[PDB]
A paper describes a structure:
Here, selenomethionine derivatization and mercury soaking have been investigated for SFX experiments using the high-energy XFEL at the SPring-8 Angstrom Compact Free-Electron Laser (SACLA), Hyogo, Japan. Three successful cases are reported of single-wavelength anomalous diffraction (SAD) phasing using X-rays of less than 1 Å wavelength with reasonable numbers of diffraction patterns (13 000, 60 000 and 11 000). We succeeded in experimental phasing using SeMet-derivatization and Hg-soaking techniques at wavelengths of 0.954 and 0.984 Å, respectively. Such high-energy X-rays, which are essential for Se-SAD, allowed us to collect data at high resolution (1.4–1.6 Å) and perform SAD phasing with 11 000–60 000 indexed patterns.
Residue numbers in the entry: 3 to 308
Write the structure that this text describes.
C-alpha cells in the first residue's frame, strides 16, 4: 500500500472523527482539543475550518438537511448549521445533554449505525493512559431525542463499527487495549454477549486501539494510537491479525474509507505530545494521511437520522 501525507491539510493537535460524505465527495473531521471542525474536498483541493468554544469529537451530516451537521459540544449533542466555509457556524441548536450532572465528562467518538442511529460514548476529560478515571458510558440517540445507555465503566469511549449483516457491533474502549464484539439487535437496538474479538497483548501490538472502521469483506481497520500503524483484523475468527500498515505519525487516531471508489483510506493522527510517549517529540506531528492500494473497498459515511 501507498501512504501519502496530505500536505494541503497541515497538522492537528488531535485530528479525529473522519467522516466521508459520498454524495458531495467531502471529508469532514475534527480536532478534539482545538475546538474546530474541518472540511476537505480532495477533488478540488478545498480546505475549510469552523471554530466553536466547546470540545468537539465528531461531525456527521444530518440526513435530509444539507448544511446541517450533528456534532458533539462537550456533553451536548447539537445540530450545527454551517455553510461549509465560514469560520463560524450560522446557528447552533442543542438536542440533548447526555450527562448534564457529570461536569468533568465529555463525548468522544461517535458514529451512526447503518440505520442512521447516532451511537457515541463519554469519558473523563482527564482520562489517562494506561490508567486514569473510568467514568464513561455508551449511548445511542433515538429519533425521539431520548438517549439509551448500553454500556458503562468505559475509560476511553472510542471506535465503533457494525457488521454488514447488522448482527454484530464492534466497540473500542482504548483503556482495555482490545476490540470487543457484541451481538446487536437491530430491531430493539440492544447489545448483548460482549466478548473480546482482538486483544493487543496477545499479538505484541503496541499502543492503544482508537478509531476503527469496517470494509466490504467484513474486516476491521483499527487505528493504533502510539503504535504508528493501522491494523487489519478479522471479524470471522477471534484474535486474527491480518495485516499491518505503518503510518509515519505515531499517534494514529482514526480511519474512514473515502474517495470516488471508496477504496482510499483516510487516516487522522494527533500531534499532541504526551508525558509518557514512546516516541520523541520530533516524530509526533499530527498529519492527515491517505492510504491507497489496500485492495478492499469500504462504505460511505452514514448520516444521522433525527
Ligand atoms: Hg465546520
Ligand atoms: Hg461548523
Ligand atoms: Mg478516538
Amino acid at each position: 500500500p501507498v501512504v501519502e501525507k496530505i500536505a494541503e491539510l497541515g497538522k492537528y493537535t488531535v485530528g479525529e472523527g473522519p467522516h466521508w460524505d459520498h454524495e458531495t465527495q467531502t471529508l469532514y473531521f475534527v480536532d478534539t482539543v482545538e475546538k474546530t471542525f474541518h472540511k476537505y474536498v480532495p477533488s478540488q483541493k478545498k480546505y475549510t475550518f469552523c471554530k466553536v468554544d466547546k470540545l468537539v469529537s465528531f461531525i456527521i451530516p444530518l440526513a435530509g438537511s444539507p448544511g446541517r451537521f450533528v456534532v458533539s459540544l462537550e456533553r451536548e449533542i447539537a445540530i450545527l448549521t454551517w455553510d461549509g466555509v465560514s469560520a463560524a457556524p450560522t446557528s447552533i441548536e442543542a438536542i440533548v445533554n447526555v450527562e448534564p450532572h457529570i461536569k468533568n465528562n465529555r463525548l468522544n467518538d461517535g458514529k451512526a449505525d447503518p440505520l442512521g442511529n447516532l451511537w457515541t460514548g463519554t469519558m473523563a476529560i482527564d482520562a489517562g493512559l494506561p490508567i486514569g478515571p473510568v467514568t464513561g458510558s455508551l449511548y445511542h440517540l433515538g429519533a425521539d431525542k431520548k438517549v439509551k445507555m448500553h454500556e458503562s465503566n468505559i475509560a476511553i469511549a472510542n471506535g465503533l463499527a457494525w457488521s454488514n449483516d447488522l448482527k454484530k457491533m464492534y466497540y473500542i474502549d482504548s483503556g482495555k487495549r482490545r476490540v470487543d464484539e457484541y451481538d446487536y439487535d437491530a430491531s430493539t437496538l440492544s447489545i448483548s454477549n460482549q466478548r473480546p474479538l482482538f486483544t493487543f497483548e496477545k499479538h505484541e501490538v503496541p499502543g492503544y486501539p482508537d478509531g476503527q472502521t469496517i470494509d466490504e469483506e467484513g474486516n476491521l481497520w483499527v487505528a493504533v494510537f502510539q503504535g504508528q500503524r493501522i491494523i487489519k483484523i478479522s471479524t470471522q475468527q477471534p484474535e486474527v491479525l491480518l495485516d499491518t500498515v505503518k503510518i509515519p505519525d505515531p499517534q494514529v487516531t482514526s480511519v474512514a474509507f473515502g474517495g470516488p471508489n471508496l477504496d482510499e483510506l483516510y487516516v487522522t493522527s494527533a500531534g499532541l505530545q504526551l508525558d509518557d510517549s514512546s516516541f520523541d517529540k520530533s516524530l509526533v506531528n499530527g498529519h492527515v494521511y491517505r492510504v491507497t492500494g489496500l485492495g478492499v473497498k469500504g462504505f460511505a459515511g452514514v448520516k444521522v437520522k433525527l
